[PDB]
Design a protein around this nucleic acid. Structure first.
Ligand code: MG
Ligand code: MG
Ligand code: MG
Ligand code: MG
Ligand code: MG
Ligand code: MG
Ligand code: MG
Ligand code: MG
Ligand code: MG
Ligand code: MG
Ligand code: MG
Ligand code: MG
Ligand code: MG
Ligand code: MG
Ligand code: MG
Lengths: 106, 197, 127, 92, 61, 155
RNA sequence: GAAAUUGUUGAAAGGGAAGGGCAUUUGAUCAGACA
RNA sequence: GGAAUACUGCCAGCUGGGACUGAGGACUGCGACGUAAGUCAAGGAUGCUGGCAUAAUGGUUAUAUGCCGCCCGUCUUGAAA
RNA sequence: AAGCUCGUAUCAGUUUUAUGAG
RNA sequence: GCCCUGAAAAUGGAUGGCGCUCAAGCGUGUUACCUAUACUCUACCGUCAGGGUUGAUGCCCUGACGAGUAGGCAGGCGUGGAGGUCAGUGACGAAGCCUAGACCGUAAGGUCGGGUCGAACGGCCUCUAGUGCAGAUCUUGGUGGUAGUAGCAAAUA
RNA sequence: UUGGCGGAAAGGCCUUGGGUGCUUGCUGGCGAAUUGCAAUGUCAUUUUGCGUGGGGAUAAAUCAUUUGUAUACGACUUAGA
């Protein structure tokens, strides 16, 4: 059809941090349509991909992926914590990420 | 979920609207604000004028052209209120600020677009009835803005055109509703009602 | 083809550089302890360089191991090379920097015959 | 954005132009062939001796402005050592 | 943190090893260390302790 | 001598591993994974396609079929964590899947795949035809629309 | 035939200093391991 | 008069989802299920499978981004002062 | 830091009991 | 109880800023949430302690600890020269120097590749000392910014 | 292709007539496989690059000279086929 999307949209908000120090090893993700930790518990363990473009072709593509997963909730408003194999660059604060439906408990 | 969110600034409180818009820009949402001259500030007109005159007092003594710059337009007053909440000396803050546009009135092409409101910043939903409030257009005119009449005339012309458009749209909506209401007895309509649609 | 070992973990891969060795040419990057009573580096304030200490010491089962899993042993001739004839899976031979090419040919031939891995088999032998 | 024009994006446009220019320059260098080849290529020097003197000597044997030169002393030593290696190869 | 009641990393001491470099004396120390461990003999304990003493603490008889 | 030989050398006798107390036990599938269930494929070549689950294989995989005549998905294996088990169910007692296994799907068209596909799809289509719009439902692909919330959607 | 300091070439950055630490993106470059 | 429920507490009741970790390296011990030989989740991870086989992972280097970081030594309570 | 001894040995910025002071 | 007055100077500026009025103010109550080198569990380094043991100041098992100026103790890294040894390295290239390359040490440092260079130099066990520099308005030598700048305008041409 | 409207930054809104496709409003028939159990598995306007070609049009500015309504030097203001 007109759509082929099998993922939920999210935004990379920032790193885990206190007022004056941050921890790049953990990222905070805001998933679309999620407003409570009770709803965010559905997405725990789901794979997250940050998909971006580069001008130089590598292995037959100009599209590069950074993989990670959802680990736990954060706060009272549906924000979750995520960990990636390589930490997100921090230029991506406010960029889009894809939360896939696998591994599936449904 | 829109790529661009157009906010009608009429009836909103400046500080709360600035806070929510600054958070949206930091999260990476593109926002246009229209009709900034119809924004509201809680408190009386003399109080808000006094605060702006204190701001006018602030200036660099040995060279005024280096000092704080006092922009008089309502859109710029709102922009100052938001820049105070964005960390604007960093690249991240500048990038967030560059996802924002503020206008007086509704210029093209935004006059033909959908405009939304922010309920947590609305005056009728926030302020207690009876508390005094201030209109940003009057405040800006008192502190030196010189385009209130031009904006008013252009807004009146826009309102006339939009009223004609709405009249045509309402006639079409009535025709569509009449054509749809006469098919509510069909088996397809019964099945959709059973399924909830 | 080395002895099985746990995954090699380095606690601090980055070099420990002397304070202000970037600031002044006359200060070398070789590590020196700051002995000043008012030194922020010595007093360990936030945002300064890290200092060497025993907590960074490496696992004793992975210590002195090359990425291939061997211990480097410097050799100068065939007699030095043949010390490792039985400890092949744990030690790799590295030819000393001052051995001539004519002798390196003999050393490489004997090491291939004895099955001993050589760390630097390309040295001075370009065709 | 600038205080004289807040509705016009400034930093993002500058960064976009910079990224585009860097990509074009890198593509031009790649097409000019100033970049090293892939590791599995036949002309790759990965894992081998890298020597400006030897590269110049073999280019001169095969047969702009450059700072890479080969001295007569080094060229003579290269010829002598190549004769030694050739004698060894003939002996075995 | 913890409020220690005693000193930390305190050595027992008790003259673990002799300060001499006499190989024969070290051999005697080895033999009597073995005897003291494998006999539970107070005589062997006393002889092993005396083999560690300095010259001014081993006066002649 | 460029380096002194060490006094002690480690032995090269590689020790054997200790006896591991880790027995393999059969997988317990989710309660919604019953043979005959319609599944949505979440990843792979056939992502977003609706297939029919037939059999649980010994390698913790699920045997699925399109059926191939309806949506072009042959007899395949899938991982149970990469599918969504819906509520729609078809009867599977008329399907004989006692031949297919890991050895069948090993790769070291053979047309035995084609013959088995025809045989299985015949019974599958016979079961499918009883429910209206089920064939069209299986031929249509699944996707998420604007504002769809997977944590609220039923399946 | 070192450093301070300088010229040329190539690469990069630069809206009222630069330098440092943690982490990653990008460009360049490179070793091991290949039965 | 007959119940239910709330609250507080207990279970050597059952069961679903997620994250980090896998130190050790023949056997020995304490136990469990078993008539039985044996088996086990009981003194620390194994089994099955896919892709790649090289700049892909990784390192180095130049820079960008987020946060942190005042110029050292000496002498003075004490020093940005 | 060295010796000698002893090691239910020696005790304790604490409480309790009895007895003083306010 | 809250609110207003209950005295104020002098460049333009501060509840930290923006701003906030059934608060984003004040008093109080109930929950949820954020995060320290702190607490809990695990791994690794070192120290100390307790046991075992016919490269024994080694090896194995277990437990607990780790701030630091003056000062104390211990183990190590590096340099010139000397005795011994490796029948050590070297014109198929010693020492030195340069290095967008590689590796080992917590570190002092050590090792390898490439370039340049053109004759000597190292490992280990010991001996010995004119043996390790960022500072001393340190000594000697060399070199910058200032800077193509100040200026080269008395004595008639 | 017909006509109307829109100057706040209009650059878009509406409409006429044929043409050419598609139509899941309903009923059918063929094809999909091996990307091997997942790996963004690449799907959207613009292109100051070239090749094909039908058409359209054939400038100025600065230095040097010169004026003094200008001027420390640049700058400014004039003039010259
Ligand atoms: Mg004015
Ligand atoms: Mg502690
Ligand atoms: Mg000379
Ligand atoms: Mg230099
Ligand atoms: Mg990488
Ligand atoms: Mg700071
Ligand atoms: Mg606050
Ligand atoms: Mg309160
Ligand atoms: Mg040499
Ligand atoms: Mg001296
Ligand atoms: Mg000096
Ligand atoms: Mg000093
Ligand atoms: Mg001086
Ligand atoms: Mg002059
Ligand atoms: Mg004169």
């Amino acid at each position: 059809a007109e759509s082929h999307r099998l993922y939920v949209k999210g935004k990379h908000l920032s790193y885990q941090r206190s007022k004056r120090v941050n921890n790049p090893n953990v990222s905070l993700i805001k998933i679309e349509g999620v407003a409570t930790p009770q709803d965010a518990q559905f997405y725990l363990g789901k794979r997250i991909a940050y998909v971006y473009r580069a001008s130089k072709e590598v292995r037959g593509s100009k599209i590069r992926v950074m993989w990670g997963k959802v680990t736990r909730t954060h706060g009272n408003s549906g924000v979750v914590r995520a960990t990636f194999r390589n930490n997100l660059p921090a230029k991506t604060f406010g960029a889009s990420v894809r939360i896939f439906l696998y591994p599936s408990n449904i | 979920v829109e790529p661009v969110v157009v906010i009608d600034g009429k009836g909103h409180l400046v500080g709360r609207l600035a806070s929510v818009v600054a958070k949206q820009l930091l999260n990476g949402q593109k926002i246009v604000v229209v009709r900034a001259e119809e924004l509201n500030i809680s408190g009386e007109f003399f109080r808000n004028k006094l605060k702006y005159h204190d701001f006018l007092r602030k200036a660099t003594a040995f060279n005024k052209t280096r000092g704080p710059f006092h922009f008089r337009a309502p859109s710029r007053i709102f922009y100052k209120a938001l820049r105070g909440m964005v960390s604007h000396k960093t690249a991240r803050g500048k990038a967030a600020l560059e996802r924002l546009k503020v206008f007086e009135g509704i210029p093209p092409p935004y006059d033909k677009k959908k405009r939304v409101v922010v309920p947590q910043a609305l005056r009728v939903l926030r302020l207690k009835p009876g508390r005094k409030y201030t209109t940003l257009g009057k405040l800006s005119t008192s502190v030196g803005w010189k385009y209130e009449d031009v904006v008013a005339k252009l807004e009146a012309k826009r309102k006339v055109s939009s009223a004609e458009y709405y009249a045509k749209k309402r006639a079409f909506t009535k025709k569509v509703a009449s054509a749809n209401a006469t098919a509510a007895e069909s088996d397809v309509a019964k099945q959709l009602a059973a399924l909830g649609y | 083809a080395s002895l099985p070992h746990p995954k090699i973990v380095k606690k601090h891969t980055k070099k420990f550089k002397r304070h202000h060795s970037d600031r002044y040419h006359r200060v070398a990057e070789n590590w020196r302890k700051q002995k000043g009573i008012d030194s922020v580096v010595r007093r360990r304030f936030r945002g300064n360089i890290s200092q060497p200490k025993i907590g960074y010491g490496s696992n004793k089962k992975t210590k002195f191991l090359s990425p291939s899993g061997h211990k480097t042993f410097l050799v100068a001739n065939v007699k030095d090379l043949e010390t490792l004839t039985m400890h092949t899976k744990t030690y790799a031979a590295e030819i000393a920097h001052n051995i001539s090419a004519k002798n390196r040919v003999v050393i490489l031939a004997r090491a291939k015959a004895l099955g001993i891995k050589v760390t630097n088999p390309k040295g001075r032998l370009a065709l | 954005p600038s205080k004289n024009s807040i509705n016009r994006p400034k930093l993002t446009s500058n960064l976009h132009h910079k990224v585009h220019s860097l990509n074009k320059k890198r593509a031009q260098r790649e097409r000019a062939g100033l970049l090293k080849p892939a590791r599995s290529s036949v002309n790759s020097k990965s894992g081998e001796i890298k020597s400006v003197a030897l590269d110049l000597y073999f280019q001169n044997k095969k047969n702009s402005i450059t700072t890479r030169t080969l001295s007569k002393k080094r060229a003579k030593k290269i010829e002598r050592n190549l004769k030694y290696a050739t004698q060894r190869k003939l002996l075995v | 943190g913890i409020d220690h009641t005693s000193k930390q990393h305190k050595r027992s001491g008790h003259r673990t090893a002799p300060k001499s470099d006499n190989v024969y004396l070290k051999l005697l120390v080895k033999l009597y260390t073995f005897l003291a461990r494998r006999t539970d003999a107070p005589f062997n304990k006393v002889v092993l302790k005396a083999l560690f003493l300095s010259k001014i603490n081993r006066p002649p008889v | 001598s460029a380096q002194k030989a060490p006094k002690w050398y480690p032995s090269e006798d590689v020790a054997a591993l200790k006896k591991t107390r880790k027995a393999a036990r059969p997988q317990k599938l989710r309660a919604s994974l019953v043979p005959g269930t319609v599944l949505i494929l979440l990843a792979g070549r056939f992502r977003g396609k609706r297939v029919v689950y037939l059999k649980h294989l010994e390698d913790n995989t699920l045997l699925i079929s399109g059926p191939f005549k309806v949506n072009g998905v042959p007899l395949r294996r899938v991982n149970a964590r990469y599918v969504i088990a819906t509520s729609t169910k078809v009867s599977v007692e008329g399907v004989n899947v006692e031949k297919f296994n890991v050895e069948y799907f090993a790769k070291e068209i053979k047309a035995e795949r084609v013959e088995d596909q025809k045989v299985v799809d015949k019974a599958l289509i016979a079961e499918i035809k009883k429910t209206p719009l089920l064939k069209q439902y299986l031929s249509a692909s699944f996707s998420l629309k604007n504002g769809d919330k997977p944590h609220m959607l039923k399946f």
